């Protein structure tokens, strides 16, 4: 036994599976070759509780008007693809009434259902790692730290691509001020092979055609500014390169469908019009 | 679907209630009622057009 | 006594006050010089009941996102003003997420809270009749019947003005195809003095500064196309002309604030882009 007694007031001073259907609003997704679906950290998206509400004004919950699947621009997977990234809610800023509520309010909160679709025949090869990264900070391309500008950090539904090797932006007069995400460094100075600590799913073309990730709202705050802060980052990397019948030049589309969930907005004002690239 | 067993695909069958321009592309069509049909072991798909009318009856 | 017996199957064959606050969504209206508020036909707006639902697909109810007050362009009341008209939902087609839901769906339904505001001093004169007219059909300006085109019939938030006298459009090559609403005929071949059969309020500048009309959804159908059909028409007429201290040239603003209520939309598709004037 030992005896412990606190001699101070403040406690700081104390000693230390395959067939699935997803319906949101007026949108429905059917899948037959699914590898199940992952709920990030086992937490389903939810609305702010009265015990955690910071803003006092009544929130607006568009529900089905905004809690529905929006499909982003399709990308092409080739043998030379290094990977793609999107930022949420940034990727949905021009998507129906969700983007309208996003830009008309000072504070916004939403979870997501991300559905990545990549169908290929039984004679194709390749694997895609689909990772949901909270606070997916990406490295810049200049000797100046944290120098990436807002326009490039928020590409929108197109997102960005990973790079095979790091290139330094030496243009002093007109710096690019863009990201330089290196695929094997995961764009953030960490080995990509460890990226599986994040919620993820692998689309192995021999097994499944799609991946589904249910992202809860993750943040150090109950609600934040959606225009300032991207809660999530979706990163897709080719773990196994695409291959097909030795024909070469094969390319298959990857489509991304994101549904915001449990959307809450506070602080209605005039609409925000961010500066464009 | 009356292709071979070795054929695979996905179709989108869409119903748009009237009032707007008739959908000329899949991007417009997916905003209305619709079903995504996967062609596999089951070669048939049913899309129900729901009764969405201002009047209680339509003319023929 | 008399005896009646039906000899057929089908039954058709058988013989024959001042201080008020209105909060909707994130919008609030305070009034101190109100002449009460009228509920048209004594019916409060409501959602479609399962016993009367024609469309089968799940509706979307944006609630606070669209059920909120939007303020239209202010008009000017002069001594020479003959009156103004707006069409609902046409006047709100470019108002936030309400217009977005209106154009993204084939079917829409909504009641309204119309708040007309016209403040003047205690040394002003004039009365405004504010009338809510179901199916406010207006007369055209050509010898061709029913020849008014869609672009003019749906002016938007600006609405239209009544005319002192009827003018015929004789331009055969380029007909105006516009309305010609005569103020004393109420724009529809009926004496304006009888327009009080419609739900209405009078803004008498000596008594009240505002009028409030709660319009239920009125139609021969439970739900209709908002782009094709204007459920309501708001007509404002000077019953007593504006006058002030004999100074002349006096003009006071009239502002219109409409909140849709109990919005229901069905038949989601690609957005409707109507042809512009």
Residues of C in contact with A63 (CB under 8 A): 60-63
Contact A268, C65 (CB under 8 A): no
d(CA A234, CA A128): 12
Which residue in this structure is represented by tokens 């405004």?
C128
Contact C241, B1 (CB under 8 A): no
Interface test with B, best of A119, A157, A205, A210 (most B CBs within 10 A): A119
Residues of C in contact with B19 (CB under 8 A): 106-107, 225, 227-228, 267, 272
Task: Please indicate whether, in this complex, the C-beta atoms of A30 and B38 are within 8 angstroms of each other.
Answer: yes
Residues of A in contact with B38 (CB under 8 A): 30, 32
Contact C180, C170 (CB under 8 A): no
Task: Please indicate whether, in this complex, the C-beta atoms of A63 and C58 are within 8 angstroms of each other.
Answer: no
Query: In 3D, which of A225, A254, A251, A220 has the Cα closest to residue A237?
Result: A254
Residues of B in contact with A32 (CB under 8 A): 38, 40
| Resolution expressed in Å | 2.6
Show the CA angle centred on residue C260, arms to residues C256 and C262, nearest 5°.
160
Interface test with A, best of C24, C57, C60 (most A CBs within 10 A): C60
- Tell me the nearest-neighbour CA distance from C20 into chain A, angstroms: 20
Contact C89, C231 (CB under 8 A): yes
Phi and psi, residue C255, nearest 5°? -110, 140
Nearest CB partner across the interface for C57, out of B30, B50, B55: B50
Q: Which chains touch C (3 or more CB pairs under 8 A)?
A: A, B
d(CA C166, CA A22): 59
Residues of C in contact with B31 (CB under 8 A): 104, 268-271
Task: Please indicate whether, in this complex, the C-beta atoms of C270 and B50 are within 8 angstroms of each other.
Answer: no
| DSSP code of residue B30 | T
Nearest CB partner across the interface for B33, out of C57, C104, C220: C57
Residues of C in contact with B49 (CB under 8 A): none
Length of chain C: 277
Nearest CB partner across the interface for A97, out of C57, C58, C97: C97
- Tell me the nearest-neighbour CA distance from B35 into chain C, angstroms: 13
- Tell me the nearest-neighbour CA distance from B4 into chain C, angstroms: 33
Task: Please indicate whether, in this complex, the C-beta atoms of A58 and C66 are within 8 angstroms of each other.
Answer: no
Kindly state whether B17 is in contact with chain A, defined as any CB-CB distance less than 8 angstroms.
no
Residues of B in contact with C272 (CB under 8 A): 19-21
Kindly state whether B21 is in contact with chain C, defined as any CB-CB distance less than 8 angstroms.
yes
Closest Cα in chain A to C101: A65
Copy the structure tokens of residue A137. 């900070």
Contact A157, A274 (CB under 8 A): no
| DSSP code of residue A101 | H
A160 burial type by CB count under 10 A (0-12 exposed, 13-18 middle, 19+ buried): buried
Residues of B in contact with A30 (CB under 8 A): 36, 38
Show the CA angle centred on residue A179, arms to residues A175 and A183, nearest 5°.
140
Phi and psi, residue A193, nearest 5°? -60, -25
d(CA C104, CA C226): 11
Residue A146, Ramachandran bin (φ over 0: left; ψ between -120 and 50: alpha; else beta): left
Task: Please indicate whether, in this complex, the C-beta atoms of A65 and C65 are within 8 angstroms of each other.
Answer: yes
Residues of A in contact with B35 (CB under 8 A): 28
Task: Please indicate whether, in this complex, the C-beta atoms of B35 and A26 are within 8 angstroms of each other.
Answer: no
Task: Please indicate whether, in this complex, the C-beta atoms of C63 and A60 are within 8 angstroms of each other.
Answer: yes
d(CA A116, CA A119): 10
Kindly state whether B20 is in contact with chain A, defined as any CB-CB distance less than 8 angstroms.
no
Pairing of strands A105-117, A252-268: antiparallel
Question: For chain B, what is the radius of gyration of the CA atoms?
Answer: 15
Task: Please indicate whether, in this complex, the C-beta atoms of B36 and A29 are within 8 angstroms of each other.
Answer: yes
Interface test with C, best of B13, B18, B19 (most C CBs within 10 A): B19
Interface test with B, best of C106, C222, C265 (most B CBs within 10 A): C106
Query: In 3D, which of A83, A85, A84, A89 has the Cα closest to residue A70?
Result: A89
Copy the structure tokens of residue A149. 């500008």
Length of chain B: 60
Phi and psi, residue C52, nearest 5°? -135, 10
Contact C65, C25 (CB under 8 A): yes
Residue numbers after which chain C breaks, C to N beyond 2.5 angstroms: 16
Q: How was this structure determined?
A: cryo-EM
Tally Cβ neighbours within 10 Å of residue B37. 19
Phi and psi, residue B15, nearest 5°? -115, 125
User: In sequence order, what are the residues at sequence separation of 6 or more whose Cβ sits closer than 8 angstroms to the Cβ of residue C115?
Assistant: C22, C29, C31, C69, C210, C211, C212, C256, C257, C258, C259
Query: In 3D, which of C261, C218, C211 has the Cα closest to residue C236?
Result: C211
Q: How far is CA B49 from CA B16, C55, C56, C227, C264, in A?
A: 9, 10, 9, 21, 19
Length of chain A: 277
d(CA C127, CA C141): 28
Name the 3-class secondary structure at A193: helix
Closest Cα in chain B to A119: B9
- Tell me the nearest-neighbour CA distance from A256 into chain C, angstroms: 19
d(CA A257, CA A24): 12
Closest Cα in chain C to B27: C270
Residues of C in contact with A60 (CB under 8 A): 25-26, 63-65
Q: Is the dihedral of CA A173, A179, A183, A185 positive or negative?
A: positive
């Amino acid at each position: 036994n030992y005896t412990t007694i606190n001699y101070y007031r403040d406690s700081a001073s104390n000693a230390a599976d395959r067939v699935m259907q997803l319906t949101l609003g007026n949108s429905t997704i059917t899948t037959q070759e699914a590898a199940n679906s992952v709920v990030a950290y086992g937490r389903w998206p939810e609305y702010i509780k009265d015990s955690e509400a910071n803003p006092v004004d009544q929130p607006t919950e568009p529900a089905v008007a905004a809690c529905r699947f929006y499909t982003l621009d399709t990308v092409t997977w080739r043998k030379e693809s290094r990977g793609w990234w999107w930022k949420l809610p940034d990727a949905l800023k021009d998507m129906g009434l969700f983007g309208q509520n996003m830009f008309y309010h000072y504070l916004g909160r939403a979870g997501y259902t991300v559905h990545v679709q990549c169908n290929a025949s039984k004679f194709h090869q390749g694997a895609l790692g689909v990772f949901a990264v909270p606070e997916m900070c990406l490295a810049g391309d200049s000797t100046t730290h944290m120098f990436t500008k807002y326009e490039n950090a928020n590409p929108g539904e197109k997102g960005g691509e990973f790079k095979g090797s790091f290139t330094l932006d030496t243009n002093a007069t007109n710096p690019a001020r863009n990201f330089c995400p290196v695929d094997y460094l995961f764009g953030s100075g960490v080995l990509a092979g460890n990226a599986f600590v994040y919620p993820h799913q692998i689309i192995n073309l021999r097994t499944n055609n799609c991946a589904t990730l249910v992202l809860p709202y993750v943040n150090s705050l109950s609600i934040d500014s959606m225009t300032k802060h991207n809660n999530w980052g979706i990163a897709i990397l080719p773990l196994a390169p695409l291959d097909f019948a030795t024909e070469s030049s094969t390319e298959i589309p990857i489509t991304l469908t994101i549904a915001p969930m449990c959307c809450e907005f506070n602080g209605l004002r005039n609409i925000t019009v961010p500066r464009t690239q | 679907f009356c292709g071979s067993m070795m054929a695979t695909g996905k179709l989108l069958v869409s119903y748009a209630p009237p009032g707007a321009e008739a959908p000329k592309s899949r991007k417009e069509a997916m905003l209305g009622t619709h079903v995504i049909w996967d062609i596999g072991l089951q070669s048939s798909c049913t899309m129900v057009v729901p009764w969405i009318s201002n009047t209680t009856y339509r003319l023929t």
